[PDB]
Design a protein that fits this description.
Keywords: Amyloidosis, Immunoglobulin kappa light chain, homodimer, Bence-Jones protein, Disulfide bond, Immunoglobulin domain, Immunoglobulin V region, immune system
Strand content of chain A: over 45%
Number of strands of chain A: 10
CATH architecture of chain A: Sandwich
Entry title: Solution structure of the KI O18/O8 Y87H immunoglobulin light chain variable domain
CATH superfamily of chain A: Immunoglobulins
PDB class: immune system
Chains A, B: Ig kappa chain V-I region AU
Largest sheet of chain A: 6 strands, mixed
Oligomer: homodimer
Assembly: dimeric
Distance between the termini of chain A: 39 Å
Radius of gyration of chain A: 13 Å
Chain lengths: 108, 108
Amino acid sequence: DIQMTQSPSSLSASVGDRVTITCQASQDISNYLNWYQQKPGKAPKLLIYDASNLETGVPSRFSGSGSGTDFTFTISSLQPEDIATYHCQQYDNLPYTFGQGTKLEIKR
Amino acid sequence: DIQMTQSPSSLSASVGDRVTITCQASQDISNYLNWYQQKPGKAPKLLIYDASNLETGVPSRFSGSGSGTDFTFTISSLQPEDIATYHCQQYDNLPYTFGQGTKLEIKR
């Protein structure tokens, strides 16, 4: 299993701010990274399935970049509905694990 | 971490055959289970996000049952394109892991 570290593990941003989440992989997973949003009453659903590649239905306000070990997830247009916990997960080697989870808040 | 044990570790079924994959969680995760299809060169694609709940874009040929520890994933109409590795993931407790990974193969 490969460890994923999210820093910051929590972040508060105002509506319209660009969220910054970095995740580091313990082992080189290349660009094979998924990003998940987990909110209460929903399942953790991925926004991105390949570093930067958005899943169908997922708004373009979510974006990620990185290849190898450093990964950065950004929400360009943060909305109230984006209040959920974000997770980075690797898909290079099983078991796939999540990098804790970043608890996102909207500050005013 | 909750461990997701899958048996068979590889399963071969004919075209149109109803595949049955059993996954066992180490701890009762209730019906909170996702199913992914991972094939070489592609990212793990989700079929089911809540044990029996199929995701949008996913055909009704996939389905799952179970709650707690025992989970059964079934493909009612197996297609040649479904040749990949299937694995269950839990979302009741972190870290989220993935099941071993069962090979779906088509036998004749």
